[PDB]
From a paper:
HLA-B*57:01, HLA-B*57:03 and HLA-B*58:01 are micropolymorphic HLA allotypes of the HLA-B17 serotype. Polymorphism within these allotypes is focussed on regions of the antigen-binding cleft (cleft polymorphisms in comparison to HLA-B*57:01: Asp114Asn and Ser116Tyr in HLA-B*57:03, and Met45Thr, Ala46Glu, Val97Arg and Val103Leu in HLA-B*58:01). Notably, residues 97, 114 and 116 contribute to the E pocket of the antigen-binding cleft, whilst residue 116 also contributes to the F pocket.
In contrast, Arg and Lys were unable to be accommodated in the E pocket of HLA-B*57:03. The deviation at PΩ-2 was concomitant with a 5.3 Å shift and 180° rotation of the PΩ-3 residue to fill the C-pocket of HLA-B*57:03. Structural analysis of bound peptide conformation showed a pronounced change in orientation of PΩ-2 Arg/Lys conferred by the Ser116Tyr polymorphism of HLA-B*57:03 that would markedly change the surface presented to T cells. In contrast, PΩ-2 Arg negatively impacted the stability of HLA-B*57:03 and HLA-B*58:01 complexes. Despite this, HLA-B*57:03, like HLA-B*57:01 and HLA-B*58:01, was more stable when in complex with peptides containing the bulky PΩTrp (compared to PΩTyr or Phe).
Residue numbers in the entry:
A (entry chain B): 1 to 99
B (entry chain C): 1 to 9
C (entry chain A): 1 to 276
The structure:
Amino acid sequence: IQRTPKIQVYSRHPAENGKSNFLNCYVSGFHPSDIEVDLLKNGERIEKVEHSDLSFSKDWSFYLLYYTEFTPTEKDEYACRVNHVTLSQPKIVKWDRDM
Amino acid sequence: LTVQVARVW
Amino acid sequence: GSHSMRYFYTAMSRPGRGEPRFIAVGYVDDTQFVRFDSDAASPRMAPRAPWIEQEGPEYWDGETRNMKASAQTYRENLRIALRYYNQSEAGSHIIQVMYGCDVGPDGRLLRGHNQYAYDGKDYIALNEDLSSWTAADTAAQITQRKWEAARVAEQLRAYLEGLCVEWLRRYLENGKETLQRADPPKTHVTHHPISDHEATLRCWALGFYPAEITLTWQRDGEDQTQDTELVETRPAGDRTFQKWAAVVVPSGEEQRYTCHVQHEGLPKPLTLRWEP
């Protein structure tokens, strides 16, 4: 029995163009623990992405926070790409400044 | 502080 | 007010790719303060919060020794579980452990925890009496019999009532600046038309600690539980947490909706509406 990840893409602080910020991708509710997470800038993989230490919730499902420093603009599009054994194909969630 | 011994199943 | 210390172990086998990985993390409330990872270049219990850094070398060496010992035991337990469930040695499996103590304002033990899972399902758990066990299946019953024979529960009770509470109290004093500070949510309501006759009202809560929070929408003073989209509380990366709740409302009826926010950091619950 396996559980597919929930995915949220968001910024640490309220986004304003030109201001330094943190781009977050939070994956949770999944099992087993193996998971592949990329942060994308205009469709391409961001290189310096860190993540939290593996932990889990009371229902034993795992969660992880992937994050990177970034400066939002009007042009630049950001997303989180996630693969998991429960997923036949990687799942892409776009950053929506109001989500 | 962690518990000091783990138990065998 | 009330506080908790929690440790979370994950032991994951990986046939053909070396010995099972062992990861341990420790929390006080919603603040991680230590980690151990057997896959690190130099595995050791390491600090993850400022207030734990003051612990001396005997703390860090002792905890490192313990985690390496625990890692070996849980690698053994993974082999044992294969036998108990008649499973092949070809698959990857996971043992999880969570244990710790809850204390009240006076620092007295409220209750202890010591629970185990195998492949994400309940395996065995120490009951609230800290003296008996609940086993989830006939495999765990074997473990229960072993642990009853060796009187494991008494040793866990001793830890949970003693060192767990004692060290939690120590951490709370050493980290009082942050562990005993509630940051209230910064809140606002956003409004976005979906169509000519419907709009989304989204109630935001940002920058709050601890993670525990209640966000609710009411329509004419009645809870809209079933029609509210509620995202999981999420970490901002700066200790604080975020959450929102959204409802879809008929255009022109926005002022019939109120967002209600409850958080430890708030002197009284907040009521917010959209402000055009």
